[PDB]
């Protein structure tokens, strides 16, 4: 867990971004969120994750799909809780998944290597 520079564009996302987080490979990072991270230094995964969720909370069209405690947490950089149905025991937050695992040379801060997943989906990878 070392500093790095986020790279990548994510994907155009419209409507309920995390609706797909509970299925298959999860959802790509919205391009407008990539816009807030790409080219910036991150001191750690935590720092990236925080700025990620802060950016989500700061995006009216994404944050509107989160209720107040999730949105409040996200403004603090805290991963929003998934619906209980999408939690996997201890894991209850939307997971930012590295599609190519870091252990397999996956880029920690490559936004295009990230999918948001529910724990339920995440744990099946």
């Amino acid at each position: 867990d070392e500093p790095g520079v986020a790279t990548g564009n994510g994907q155009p996302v419209t409507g309920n971004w995390l609706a797909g987080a509970s299925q298959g490979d999860g959802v790509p990072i919205p391009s407008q969120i990539a816009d807030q991270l790409r080219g910036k230094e991150f001191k750690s995964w935590r720092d990236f994750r925080e700025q990620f969720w802060v950016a989500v909370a700061n995006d009216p069209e994404l944050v509107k799909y989160f209720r107040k405690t999730n949105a409040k947490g996200m403004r603090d950089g805290l991963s929003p809780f998934t619906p209980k149905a999408e939690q996997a025991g201890g894991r209850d937050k939307y997971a930012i998944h590295h599609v190519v695992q870091i252990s397999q040379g996956g880029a920690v801060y490559d936004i295009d290597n990230l999918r948001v997943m529910t724990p339920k989906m995440h744990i099946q990878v």
Partner: peptide, 14 residues
């Protein structure tokens, strides 16, 4: 569980 905090239904007070 956490839904009662984080996923108030449309009819529920957030």
């Amino acid at each position: 569980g956490t839904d009662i905090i984080f996923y108030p239904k449309e009819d529920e007070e957030d």
